[PDB]
Amino acid sequence: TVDFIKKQIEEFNIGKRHLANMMGEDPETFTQEDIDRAIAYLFPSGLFEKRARPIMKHPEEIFPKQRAIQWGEDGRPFHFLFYTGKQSYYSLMHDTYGKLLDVEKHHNQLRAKDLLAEKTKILKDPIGSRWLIKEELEEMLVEKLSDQDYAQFIRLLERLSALPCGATEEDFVNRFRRSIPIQSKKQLIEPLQYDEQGMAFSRGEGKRKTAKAEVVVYGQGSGRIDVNGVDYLLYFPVTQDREQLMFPLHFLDRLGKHDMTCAVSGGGRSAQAGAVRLAMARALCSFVTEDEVEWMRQAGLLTADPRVRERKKPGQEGARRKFTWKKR
Amino acid sequence: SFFTKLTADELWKGALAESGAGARKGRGKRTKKKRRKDLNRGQIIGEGRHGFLWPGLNIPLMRNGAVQTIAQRSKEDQEKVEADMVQQREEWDRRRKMKVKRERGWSGNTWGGVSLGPPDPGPNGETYDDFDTRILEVRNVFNMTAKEGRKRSVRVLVAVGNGKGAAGFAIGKATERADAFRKAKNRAVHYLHYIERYEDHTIYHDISLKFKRTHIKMKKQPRGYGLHCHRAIMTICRLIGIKDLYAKVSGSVNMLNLTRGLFLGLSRQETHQQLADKKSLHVVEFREECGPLPIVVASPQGALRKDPEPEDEVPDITLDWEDVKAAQGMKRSVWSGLKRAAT
Amino acid sequence: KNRAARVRVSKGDKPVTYEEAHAPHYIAHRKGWLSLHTGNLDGEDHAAERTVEDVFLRKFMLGTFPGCLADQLVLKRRANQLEICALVLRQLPPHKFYFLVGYSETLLSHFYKCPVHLHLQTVPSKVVYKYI
Amino acid sequence: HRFMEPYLFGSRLGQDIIDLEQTAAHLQLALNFTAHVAYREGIILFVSRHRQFAHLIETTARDCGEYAHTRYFKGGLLTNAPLLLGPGVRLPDLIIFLHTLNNVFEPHVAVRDAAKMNIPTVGIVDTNCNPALITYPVPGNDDSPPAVRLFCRLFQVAISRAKEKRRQVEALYRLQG
Amino acid sequence: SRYGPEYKDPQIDKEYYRKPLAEQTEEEKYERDFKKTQLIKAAPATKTSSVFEDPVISKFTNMMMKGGNKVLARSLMTQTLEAVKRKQFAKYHAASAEEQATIERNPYTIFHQALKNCEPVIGLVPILKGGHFYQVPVPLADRRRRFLAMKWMIAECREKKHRRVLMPEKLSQELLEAFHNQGPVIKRKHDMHKMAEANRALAHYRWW
RNA sequence: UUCGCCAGAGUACUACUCGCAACUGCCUAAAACUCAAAGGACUUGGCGGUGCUUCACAUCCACCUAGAGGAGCCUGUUCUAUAAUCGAUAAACCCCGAUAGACCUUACCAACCCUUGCCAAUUCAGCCUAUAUACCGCCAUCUUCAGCAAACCCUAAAAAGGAACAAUAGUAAGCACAAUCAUAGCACAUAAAAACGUUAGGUCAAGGUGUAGCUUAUGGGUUGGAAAGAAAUGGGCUACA
Ligand SMILES: [Mg+2]
Ligand SMILES: [Mg+2]
Ligand SMILES: [Mg+2]
Ligand SMILES: [Mg+2]
Ligand SMILES: [Mg+2]
Ligand SMILES: [Mg+2]
Ligand SMILES: [Mg+2]
Ligand SMILES: [Mg+2]
Ligand SMILES: [Mg+2]
Ligand SMILES: [Mg+2]
Ligand SMILES: [Mg+2]
Ligand SMILES: [Mg+2]
Ligand SMILES: [Mg+2]
Ligand SMILES: [Mg+2]
Ligand SMILES: [Mg+2]
Ligand SMILES: [Mg+2]
Ligand SMILES: [Mg+2]
Ligand SMILES: [Mg+2]
Ligand SMILES: [Mg+2]
Ligand SMILES: [Mg+2]
Ligand SMILES: [Mg+2]
Ligand SMILES: [Mg+2]
Ligand SMILES: [Mg+2]
Ligand SMILES: [Mg+2]
Ligand SMILES: [Mg+2]
Ligand SMILES: [Mg+2]
Ligand SMILES: [Mg+2]
Ligand SMILES: [Mg+2]
Ligand SMILES: [Mg+2]
Ligand SMILES: [Mg+2]
Ligand SMILES: [Mg+2]
Structure with missing residues (x-):
């Protein structure tokens, strides 16, 4: 299928030129972020699966990596490990073992000469380097891979890295390394806002069990809550609901140092109490140092409550309660 | 009423009950007659009951340089056309009802000895056109499965041979009989034996072989004793190229064991040239009808030993009682000298 | 076991189309609807009339083009004019194809009191998506 | 092994001793056959299942330009070649065994597959082969x-x-016409 | 169930975070608690940072709650505490000077002491051996003992009272009787202990 | 090189003889009669109140909560009773076909009428007549179990099986599983999906149907009735505070 992909490349180039001409943009500056945008407009297919939508990419992404020819016209295989089944993986293993042996002999000679110039280049914790996954290795090597052979390759790579690294060995071992994303879970702290000559003004939002609450906090007033135009004592007759309001302020010892006005809609009494508690906790982050906001998030004030009522299932009573199952 | 109709595919699928639940485990096979007729075989899309000849479907669009108007056939023409259409129905039914008789290798209702055609060509392009194959045994093999229960699979023994001394055998097992035939044919060519045939009509010497539990006694025969052997050994020898042979099978008559033993015995033959090489003596044939003429068949190439072999006054040969009875004329069985058909 | 709009898997030699290879639970996920109209919206009406017209069109076209139809028709309803898109095997001559399309464009129009458009795409054979 | 008795010179306090006269006699024929196969443009595969000299065998095959197999030998490699290697693949014309026995102290699969497929095999055999x-x-x-x-x-x-002499013979063939 | 296995239980104690510098062993754990990107579940509505709430009181209220009337259960608990406080105050004022230094009026401590007094020491497990069930004596876990202590009192006060008598009124008397080691809950605990002492010879049937 | 035995199985370590300190005894030892088999070994499933490891997360127990079986009512069945439908009727039926019965629905019955009787026509229409043990269409159960399976290859033959990662004959498209998708952000959960087959499982009464039966009738229309509870039982509501 070597010629088929080549023909598809020319057809894709011609189609890209035509798409640029019909869309009105410069074909020279036409890129994939414009190709997909124009496709989504010309063929607006509304489907839940993204892969089912129309797509026009370069053939190298659409078609998978096709295996190259292995033997010439005379039938003689090119690579010397063709009859091993996996001529790419086994060649890689052979090269890795040869480099390991070269490193070992060079280190033995250096120790005989009583010289130590190498360093430990295996600790990549600050960089955030990891080993290749099976899919990543199968992307590099066109042939299919297994689990045991992948484990052997990883365990040989770590053996090679555990030895005094050479000059050309480090770059070879680095191409099998992948960077990981930031695992920091620190939330964004809203800056203090000053609106209408008002100092220490902040806003927060919360949601819990179909209840939306928006709370504005002023850091210069006394401690009181105004909910929906009425005081919290009147709006929450139940003491537990008022304890929900007290939970964030008591954790920060800011009972009588902030004035809060809340607007909460939806849900019941407890759902509204939870929503306003979450909104107040998220809004108080601006008035507190970075040390206690983490304490609040560890105490469970800055995290949402995904506990939502499950939909009732057909043939059941309450999405869990089954009907009376008669054995006979 | 029009919305209540369905398609012909569903109508036939429901009428034939091909995917019925009673024909799965084996409750069927009572009425084994499944026939589906395509109703759109000889129906012209333009023809109809009223006999209108549309310019775009029935008649050519332009005739005599002008356009044709909507016309209708006469009653006699419609009768002629419908008579031809009816005649086509019985013409097709005549072909459908006719069944060609199957091959009778050994009997009218068996697959033993029937011809299966030349084997399929190999991947590299080699074609086996001179090779002919025969089926020796077809057996329905059943296996017990956890879900279905009995699992019927057909196992077929198939022997290939070209008539020039090259032949082989194989076993193909598959769910379908045709698939088993194909698997056996495609696998027989990979295991081919070469049989040394004396004068290309008989074997060099008599062989008495004892397989697992089957005893095979084969004796060399002249040009006038053509293939007086078992009904399967005759087919195997016909495929190999042997035209004259006498073989007796005693003990178990298992087809696979018989075939394996026959092939082993034919492969373990000792050629006259091999005997001459191993004995360093001339091999001389004394033909009965050629008198005392010392015909030499094999020459001991190499060092010809001048020391004569030790002439034993009493040979200690492991004789056979059946052969002794045959030589002494004690074989009074009525089945030994029966007149049979030709090879 | 679910059996609605589901073609059972054979030994591995039957040809299936893209629409046939997808179960009905994949509708609007991997495959779309064969017909589009405004009758199946929230605040709209006249849905039964559209459904019966669509099914009559299916049954009429199946007999109109026997044996040469590749897959299910596409019935687009857009501002009082009805478009019917079909995929047909190139078994019939274009002389007969034009006769059939000219016949249908007027028959359906006069039967449903609305303008219709008929579009046919000729294919050498049925397109195979899964194992064939 | 019972079949190594004719190839043994004797036993020196339990350890069997292999005679070198027959060793050299067999080795001359083996080297001549291998050189002729290489000269006639034949595919030579060095097979050995032994986890001590695998790298050495791979390097030797790379230097020779012939092919090597020192890893786990798959089941239908030589037999089911059209499905294990490719659509149409040319089987090796010579198999050289550097270790007849595998890691399980059993005869190798290829030593039987070559005989099944009619592939000549030159092999180094120890006293237990x-x-x-x-x-x-x-x-x-x-x-x-x-x-x-x-x-x-x-x-x-x-x-x-063998390869150098083949090249020289072709160079002379070029001047011959 | 919506929370994944990576979610960790929150810490509500404010003094745990107020002084992290007083010890170094807790520092090594609380510094890596957030480093591993450990997600924390939402704090339950029942549990808060208030100093006047107790987990034992919350558990007892949850056990007394019928259906989902948490407000009614909380009202019953508050009324029971008020009743025990007033009954203790009445006896404090009716007693002389020497008894005032011994009688306790705090409801929380007397509730905890009554629960501990009615907590069983060992329980019985039915083990099938030879086709018959034997009540093998067995040591009980702390949570099981506390749950049994609460459940015995709740079951006794729900059924062994008159219709006119209210739940807080019955519970106030029962708490005092349990605190003074005179209640039917204590009698039931003694009965269980005597049954265990009778079946002690069958303790070899246990295999754990 | 010899001796003692073996001629289908049951009859039969039997009957009838001889011999024996044995007298319900031992040795030798048939026949009538019945069958086309009787037997030894092996493969794969299934099973095991066999044994050894790992499990059960609403599942078995150790344990938690709320109910049924007690009362009334509603409703569905099994029974008696009428001229008065039918099917389901172990898990997988029992507020099930029916997200639904005063006429109609309604296929049931009694009284009465019409017989090329819906359609352009048809020695034709029409049948809720039988067969779900002939079907398609749709589902139930194993079943949130993972296996099914085309093309090959191997076994000192092959019924069948095909594995050792420091690897011992296994490659394998595909369908399953998984992933993805939806519950408009992730994760979880739910939903959805769940192949090949087992139960000749349910459905000729959603609809058409192969076969066998009706045609002044098993077809088509109108009116009136299709009770009732001696009794038992399933599932729910109300409570017994
Ligand atoms: Mg509920
Ligand atoms: Mg016959
Ligand atoms: Mg026989
Ligand atoms: Mg050795
Ligand atoms: Mg007998
Ligand atoms: Mg006896
Ligand atoms: Mg006797
Ligand atoms: Mg349960
Ligand atoms: Mg209740
Ligand atoms: Mg009850
Ligand atoms: Mg009751
Ligand atoms: Mg009924
Ligand atoms: Mg019934
Ligand atoms: Mg059942
Ligand atoms: Mg009526
Ligand atoms: Mg009625
Ligand atoms: Mg009727
Ligand atoms: Mg059935
Ligand atoms: Mg699997
Ligand atoms: Mg097999
Ligand atoms: Mg596969
Ligand atoms: Mg999502
Ligand atoms: Mg998931
Ligand atoms: Mg589901
Ligand atoms: Mg899935
Ligand atoms: Mg049935
Ligand atoms: Mg039934
Ligand atoms: Mg019907
Ligand atoms: Mg019926
Ligand atoms: Mg009842
Ligand atoms: Mg129900």
Whole structure:
């Protein structure tokens, strides 16, 4: 299928030129972020699966990596490990073992000469380097891979890295390394806002069990809550609901140092109490140092409550309660 | 009423009950007659009951340089056309009802000895056109499965041979009989034996072989004793190229064991040239009808030993009682000298 | 076991189309609807009339083009004019194809009191998506 | 092994001793056959299942330009070649065994597959090997590193000489016409 | 169930975070608690940072709650505490000077002491051996003992009272009787202990 | 090189003889009669109140909560009773076909009328007549179990099986599983999906149907009735505070 992909490349180039001409943009500056945008407009297919939508990419992404020819016209295989089944993986293993042996002999000679110039280049914790996954290795090597052979390759790579690294060995071992994303879970702290000559003004939002609450906090007033135009004592007759309001302020010892006005809609009494508690906790982050906001998030004030009522299932009573199952 | 109709595919699928639940485990096979007729075989899309000849479907669009108007056939023409259409129905039914008789290798209702055609060509392009194959045994093999229960699979023994001394055998097992035939044919060519045939009509010497539990006694025969052997050994020898042979099978008559033993015995033959090489003596044939003429068949190439072999006054040969009875004329069985058909 | 709009898997030699290879639970996920109209919206009406017209069109076209139809028709309803898109095997001559399309464009129009458009795409054979 | 008795010189306090006269006699024929196969443009595969000299065998095959197999030998490799290797693949014309026995102390799969597929096999056999199916058995030691290196270098130089002489013969053939 | 296995239980104690510098062993754990990107579940509505709430009181209220009337259960608990406080105050004022230094009026401590007094020491497990069930004596876990202590009192006060008598009124008397080691809950605990002492010879049937 | 035995199985370590300190005894030892088999070994499933490891997360127990079986009512069945439908009727039926019965629905019955009787026509229409043990269409159960399976290859033959990662004959498209998708952000959960087959499982009464039966009738229309509870039982509501 070597010629088929080549023909598809020319057809894709011609189609890209035509798409640029019909869309009105410069074909020279036409890129994939414009190709997909124009496709989504010309063929607006509304489907839940993204892969089912129309797509026009370069053939190298659409078609998978096709295996190259292995033997010439005379039938003689090119690579010397063709009859091993996996001529790419086994060649890689052979090269890795040869480099390991070269490193070992060079280190033995250096120790005989009583010289130590190498360093430990295996600790990549600050960089955030990891080993290749099976899919990543199968992307590099066109042939299919297994689990045991992948484990052997990883365990040989770590053996090679555990030895005094050479000059050309480090770059070879680095191409099998992948960077990981930031695992920091620190939330964004809203800056203090000053609106209408008002100092220490902040806003927060919360949601819990179909209840939306928006709370504005002023850091210069006394401690009181105004909910929906009425005081919290009147709006929450139940003491537990008022304890929900007290939970964030008591954790920060800011009972009588902030004035809060809340607007909460939806849900019941407890759902509204939870929503306003979450909104107040998220809004108080601006008035507190970075040390206690983490304490609040560890105490469970800055995290949402995904506990939502499950939909009732057909043939059941309450999405869990089954009907009376008669054995006979 | 029009919305209540369905398609012909569903109508036939429901009428034939091909995917019925009673024909799965084996409750069927009572009425084994499944026939589906395509109703759109000889129906012209333009023809109809009223006999209108549309310019775009029935008649050519332009005739005599002008356009044709909507016309209708006469009653006699419609009768002629419908008579031809009816005649086509019985013409097709005549072909459908006719069944060609199957091959009778050994009997009218068996697959033993029937011809299966030349084997399929190999991947590299080699074609086996001179090779002919025969089926020796077809057996329905059943296996017990956890879900279905009995699992019927057909196992077929198939022997290939070209008539020039090259032949082989194989076993193909598959769910379908045709698939088993194909698997056996495609696998027989990979295991081919070469049989040394004396004068290309008989074997060099008599062989008495004892397989697992089957005893095979084969004796060399002249040009006038053509293939007086078992009904399967005759087919195997016909495929190999042997035209004259006498073989007796005693003990178990298992087809696979018989075939394996026959092939082993034919492969373990000792050629006259091999005997001459191993004995360093001339091999001389004394033909009965050629008198005392010392015909030499094999020459001991190499060092010809001048020391004569030790002439034993009493040979200690492991004789056979059946052969002794045959030589002494004690074989009074009525089945030994029966007149049979030709090879 | 679910059996609605589901073609059972054979030994591995039957040809299936893209629409046939997808179960009905994949509708609007991997495959779309064969017909589009405004009758199946929230605040709209006249849905039964559209459904019966669509099914009559299916049954009429199946007999109109026997044996040469590749897959299910596409019935687009857009501002009082009805478009019917079909995929047909190139078994019939274009002389007969034009006769059939000219016949249908007027028959359906006069039967449903609305303008219709008929579009046919000729294919050498049925397109195979899964194992064939 | 019972079939190694004719190939043994004797036993020196429990350890069997392999005679070297027959070793050299077999090795001359083996090297001549390998050189002729290389000269006639034949595919030569060095097979050995032994986790001590795998890298050495791979390097020797790379230097020779011939192919090597020192990893786990798959089941239908030589037999089901059209499905294991590719649509149409040319099987090796010579198989050279550097270790007849595998890691499980059993006869190798290829030593039987080559006989099944009619592929000539030159093989180094120790006192515990089975030379019945090997076309050219060489009675020697396959456990000593110098012993392995000696055979590897002998086959390396045989292949190099065969290829160089083939090239010289072709160069002369070019001037012949 | 919506929370994944990576979610960790929150810490509500404010003094745990107020002084992290007083010890170094807790520092090594609380510094890596957030480093591993450990997600924390939402704090339950029942549990808060208030100093006047107790987990034992919350558990007892949850056990007394019928259906989902948490407000009614909380009102019953508050009324029971008020009743025990007033009954203790009445006896404090009716007693002389020497008894005032011994009688306790705090409801929380007397509730905890009554629960501990009615907590069983060992329980019985039915083990099937030879086709018959034997009540093998067995040591009980702390949570099981506390749950049994609460459940016995709740079951006794729900059924062994008159219709006119209210739940807080019955519970106030029962708490005092349990605190003074005179209640039917204590009698039931003694009965269980005597049954265990009778079946002690069958303790070899246990295999754990 | 010899001796003692073996001629289908049951009859039969039997009957009838001889011999024996044995007298319900031992040795030797048939026949009538019945069958086309009787037997030894092996493969794969299934099973095991066999044994050894790992499990059960609403599942078995150790344990938690709320109910049924007690009362009334509603409703569905099994029974008696009428001229008065039918099917389901172990898990997988029992507020099930029916997200639904005063006429119609309604296929049931009694009284009465019409017989090329819906359609352009048809020695034709029409049948809720039988067969779900002939079907398609749709589902139930194993079943949130993972296996099914085309093309090959191997076994000192092959019924069948095909594995050792420091690897011992296994490659394998595909369908399953998984992933993805939806519950408009992730994760979880739910939903959805769940192949090949087992139960000749349910459905000729959603609809058409192969076969066998009706045609002044098993077809088509109108009116009136299709009760009732001696009794038992399933599932729910109300409570017994
Ligand atoms: Mg509920
Ligand atoms: Mg016959
Ligand atoms: Mg026989
Ligand atoms: Mg050795
Ligand atoms: Mg007898
Ligand atoms: Mg006896
Ligand atoms: Mg006796
Ligand atoms: Mg349960
Ligand atoms: Mg209740
Ligand atoms: Mg009850
Ligand atoms: Mg009741
Ligand atoms: Mg009924
Ligand atoms: Mg019934
Ligand atoms: Mg059932
Ligand atoms: Mg009526
Ligand atoms: Mg009625
Ligand atoms: Mg009727
Ligand atoms: Mg059925
Ligand atoms: Mg699997
Ligand atoms: Mg097999
Ligand atoms: Mg596969
Ligand atoms: Mg999502
Ligand atoms: Mg998931
Ligand atoms: Mg589901
Ligand atoms: Mg899935
Ligand atoms: Mg049935
Ligand atoms: Mg039924
Ligand atoms: Mg019907
Ligand atoms: Mg019926
Ligand atoms: Mg009842
Ligand atoms: Mg129900």
